[PDB]
Structure 1
Amino acid sequence: GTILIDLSPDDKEFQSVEEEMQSTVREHRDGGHAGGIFNRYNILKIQKVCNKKLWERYTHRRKEVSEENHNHANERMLFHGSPFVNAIIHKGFDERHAYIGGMFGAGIYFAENSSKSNQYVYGIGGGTGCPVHKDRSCYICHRQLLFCRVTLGKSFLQFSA
């Protein structure tokens, strides 16, 4: 059901997604251990993910949340990095994509900082790094992140380190 449409680097949509990626890089407290050492990315491709069944599933749930929260979905665009990115784009997010040991319990995690999601592309803690070189700081191998539409509704605010 999923088709991927390549965006041109000339398209304003490509450019606005690239800018969110690059401008939300930060330094991490692990000194680069999980995600590598970098201040910016080389963007190679941006594709739009189109799947009508998955979209209608999302909009159905969004309307439910919206009606439970004074007609406010509280929708955000957020990053997600995962070894399961191929499953997610074809079958949607589900319980198999949860961070069982995350600090806010077993759910599906998203970040405003692209560099935070980058830490999970090869697994929790960066896993063993890229499959080819076993390097969490590989500058050669191609990585993939999702930029996702997320319905927060009424969100429980946890102050935390």
Structure 2
Amino acid sequence: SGTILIDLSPDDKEFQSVEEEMQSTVREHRDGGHAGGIFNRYNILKIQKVCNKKLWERYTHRRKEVSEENHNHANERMLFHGSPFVNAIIHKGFDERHAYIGGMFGAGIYFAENSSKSNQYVYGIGGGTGCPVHKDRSCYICHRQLLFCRVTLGKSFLQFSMAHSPPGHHSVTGRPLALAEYVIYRGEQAYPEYLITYQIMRPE
């Protein structure tokens, strides 16, 4: 594999930074929690820095190609990703070949600036069948995983409510409550930097 997981202490400023981004970017969704469950906060159990030399070299290499095509600017963002493939992704990297061509913005790898948006995809599209144990999209017991990834957007194409990025572009920015979604069409345009193990918290 070549992937090493570095457990971050809760008292580490790095852990706290990722923890605060996760908690502070939660929103009330249009679907009343149908997809990702009902909650306004998380129980953050574990934040691990994903360390893989091969995947990092792959990412930096593509980042340079994108910068040269976009006026020496990668347009790099820290974004959340959720999918049933998190354990595969941290070992083999993101893989466009597994992207679903029926998705809202086509066969791409989706990211969000709102943790609660990526939480909607943890158990599949529209939260699929929910948690494997209880078949519950609002399950407060089963532990979920998000990635907080370094994403090269380059020149992003604005699209409203597609196998590759349009000509001259490196990504898609969607806006459908309008929460921004970001789509890349090449797996090496994202590094899965932090693995976050959490639960959605039951409201009082």
Q: TM-score, normalised by structure 2?
A: 0.76
Q: 1:43 to 1:97 in 2, by over 3 A?
A: farther
SS in 2 for 1:48: strand
Deviations 1:59-118 (A, max 9, x none): 000000001111100000000001000110000001244243222211111001100000
Deviations 1:120-157 (A, max 9, x none): 10011111111111110000110000000000001111
Task: List alignment gaps of at least 5 residues for structure 1.
Answer: none
Task: Judge conservation of contact 1:99–1:109 (CA < 8 Å) in 2.
Answer: no
Task: Judge conservation of contact 1:35–1:126 (CA < 8 Å) in 2.
Answer: yes
Amino-acid identity (%): 100
Task: Judge conservation of contact 1:25–1:114 (CA < 8 Å) in 2.
Answer: yes
Structure 2 partner of 1:158: 159
What CA RMSD, in Å, does the superposition of the two structures yield over aligned residues?
Answer: 0.9
- Aligned pairs, number: 159
Counterpart CA distance in 1 for 2:98 and 2:42 is 25
Task: List alignment gaps of at least 5 residues for structure 2.
Answer: 161-204
Counterpart CA distance in 1 for 2:102 and 2:112 is 16
Task: Judge conservation of contact 1:22–1:41 (CA < 8 Å) in 2.
Answer: yes
SS in 2 for 1:49: strand
Structure 1 partner of 2:197: none
Structure 1 partner of 2:3: 2
Question: More displaced, 56-65 or 99-108?
Answer: 99-108
SS in 2 for 1:89: helix
Deviation at 1:27, TM superposition (A): 0.8
Deviations 1:5-42 (A, max 9, x none): 00001110000000000000001111111100000000
SS in 2 for 1:136: coil
